Amino acid sequence: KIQLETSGALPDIIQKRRSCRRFDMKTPVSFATFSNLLSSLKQILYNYASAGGLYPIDVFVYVKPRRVEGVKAGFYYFNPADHSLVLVNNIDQVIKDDHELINQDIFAQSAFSVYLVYNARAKYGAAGYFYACIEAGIITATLNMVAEDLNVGLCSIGHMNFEEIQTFLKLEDHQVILHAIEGLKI
Amino acid sequence: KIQLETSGALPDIIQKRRSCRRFDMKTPVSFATFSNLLSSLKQILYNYASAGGLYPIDVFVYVKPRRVEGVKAGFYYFNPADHSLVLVNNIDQVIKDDHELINQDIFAQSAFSVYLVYNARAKYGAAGYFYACIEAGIITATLNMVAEDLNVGLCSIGHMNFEEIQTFLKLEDHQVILHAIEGLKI
Amino acid sequence: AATLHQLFIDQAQRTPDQVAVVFEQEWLTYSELDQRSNQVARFLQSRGIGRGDRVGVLAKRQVETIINLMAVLKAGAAYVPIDPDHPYERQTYILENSSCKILLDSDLYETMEISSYADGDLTPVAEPEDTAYVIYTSGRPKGVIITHQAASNTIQDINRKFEVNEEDRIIGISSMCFDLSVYDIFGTLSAGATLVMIRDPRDMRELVRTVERRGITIWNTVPAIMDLALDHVGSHFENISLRLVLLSGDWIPLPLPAKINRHFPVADVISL
Amino acid sequence: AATLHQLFIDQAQRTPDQVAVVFEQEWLTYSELDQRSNQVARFLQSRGIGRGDRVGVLAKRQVETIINLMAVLKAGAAYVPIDPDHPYERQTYILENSSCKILLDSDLYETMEISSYADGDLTPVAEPEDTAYVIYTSGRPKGVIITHQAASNTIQDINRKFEVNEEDRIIGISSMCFDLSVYDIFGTLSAGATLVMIRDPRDMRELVRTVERRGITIWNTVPAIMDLALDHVGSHFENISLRLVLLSGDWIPLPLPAKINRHFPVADVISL
């Protein structure tokens, strides 16, 4: 039966953050801002924890037309080894029907989409998946805070019709999407 | 086929953090530091994301004898509603045998232990567990960073014999531990 | 003043790496299409195809078909589109009536090993006053001759009036035996835009899905097609990529305009 | 100068909310034990128990047993521990030989509704020179009388020499029919420490597990018990809570000292 200090701390990237859902659909995300928000998974040594130095979460992003200076619209695969973005599909694009119900307008105003995919290789034998789900939350939380170092709004999406997102990204049978995030606000 | 800026950003709570495994077993964690590291899940509105405003991750902590000013050794249940710590067991204590293999000396030097338990209630029907695993990674990442605002070292533990930790905490059948963390360093 | 292939040849220089035509997972850039159609054109010339001739082209919904149409025009001949779904008796009548020299199918490029020809620019042959294609109608079928100049004037008047450019995407709904498809192909390629081809023009639910999935900006059909497409769409559907709906015809079902602007609010509806 | 229960009574004042004795999930604070043993003591007095008498107490490994032992001493009598595992013939011999008035079992407090008695301090009865308990030995059994003063001097000499205090935990391994248990009980309660009781003294793997799980700091047994305990322990086991190993006896197996200090490096090994 103990009481704790409610008197202290200076939360700046943790309290100034919050699930954002309204974005300025007019200002582009400066090529600097974007290339830094994505610095987090730079890369072996990374800036976040991972079970057994495995880092199996492959990250993809979708970019809306002309809403990120320096990036053509399309689906990209970010590379940690190079801090790079290779285009994988620029003809197709995610649509409102890929989302559902309450998430229609979130994606509408969004600028870009971040996808966290569990690269199912090794060491744990079907517990690496459990460890991957935690790693997706780890990654999510770093990004959401680093997005507060730069006034980038963020909102997590639990479920979503990854049925065809799966193919537009060219995922394997051993690649399964776990989490998605929509990411400037005013 | 695109390249990104490796030129920028100021990571302070994200790069200055790292899995710590050596602790000063002599200096106690000041009652302020401890009560602030635990401010993160203060609490409805919290300082981290949660699927559907559910926040089902109940948090427990174990405290070693005389290594945290103002806290008797024992097992505690932190309360978000009150920012409080109720003792649940001060006779028993976690032992090296509860850990395994490579994790023996981590717990040895540790000062306290943080346990993240998935309160299995509601809305998603067995997908709330999946959403809880991500939330544990979310919680883990905020704590690890807030522990960098205060020079508190942290290290995640994937597996551990929660067989009897389960009972010393008085967990239900609907409470399942997901993650554990050992937390000053030099 | 203009030929259809020269209009495209000029745009290939301006934007070589722009995607010119996509079917499903197949695609061609402006320079790939220019290069390969130069080679097929040379192959056709080795077969005596030149000025004054007519070349049959099966109107398969494939990117290679675009290669063939452009090659016929580059060799100096006019193409006669043949609907692959018509019975053989109707196909034969049209080929004879138009005095076609040969009939071209897709896969021509690969199985004749035409990559072995030079892919550089050809010596001009066709003049603005020469025939570019022959469209047969009212299937009894009457073939109508269309010159390079008449077609160029039409597609350029449209490109200029509605400012079609590199950011635009045209959905290739109508058969390439139909006159409306001449804009889908050569109007797109004259403005630097992208043609998105369709496998089945009767799969309505896929037509409206392609508009969302591939960011279609320009819809160019008869009124009936748009009407039937909006029957297979949700009550609260709304698409913002479509900015231009070209409808050709005098007969428009009465609630269609109001329907287009509920499900395509950005779309400008034109009744030419 | 001292009685066993007064030593504890004084410590209950200093630390009322310290845990005095834990069995498994049962436990008593210093004031709960003082309060309840005052009530049982009054119940015993209503039964004529007083100075000069002997009271049999079944040595069950329960916290209530501690209540009863303390109550007998508070009522002014001496207790005679009875081993619940001995045959009835041996139990009877000891009860008659020691002229015990009654035999006490655990659950006495509940089923006689003794919470209804006053729980306040009693009027002193026992003097340092009065008998505190009678230990029978070499089971033929000979009962040895021990006064309050002789027992107090022993437990206090040990508490002072090794600085036993509130931070200490004693594991109650030996039977309460054995003399070593008088320190486990009253030495613990004279110093403000905590007694951790054991269900089965022969379950070696549980003895060494209790040392880790409940932070045992003091081990007080004959050499044989520690020797058998270290046979059921891992090669690389090491515990740092145990600081004091009290071994009473002349016969120590030769590798045991070296063994104790490999698996209990902080432990000071005393051969009294």
Ligand SMILES: Cc1cc2nc3c(=O)[nH]c(=O)nc-3n(C[C@H](O)[C@H](O)[C@H](O)COP(=O)(O)O)c2cc1C
């Ligand atoms: C794993 C996860 C999945 C989520 N999925 C969704 C979602 O599908 N739709 C949505 O609107 N919000 C989603 N959220 C966000 C929460 O519903 C909500 O915003 C929560 O309140 C976190 O933001 P807050 O900081 O404002 O509370 C998700 C959050 C998490 C952690």
Ligand SMILES: Cc1cc2nc3c(=O)[nH]c(=O)nc-3n(C[C@H](O)[C@H](O)[C@H](O)COP(=O)(O)O)c2cc1C
């Ligand atoms: C979910 C999870 C579980 C982990 N479990 C363990 C563990 O059991 N033992 C361990 O030594 N490290 C564990 N780690 C930490 C990683 O093994 C390792 O420290 C990783 O390198 C992260 O720290 P870094 O920032 O130094 O890389 C875990 C990390 C995560 C994310």
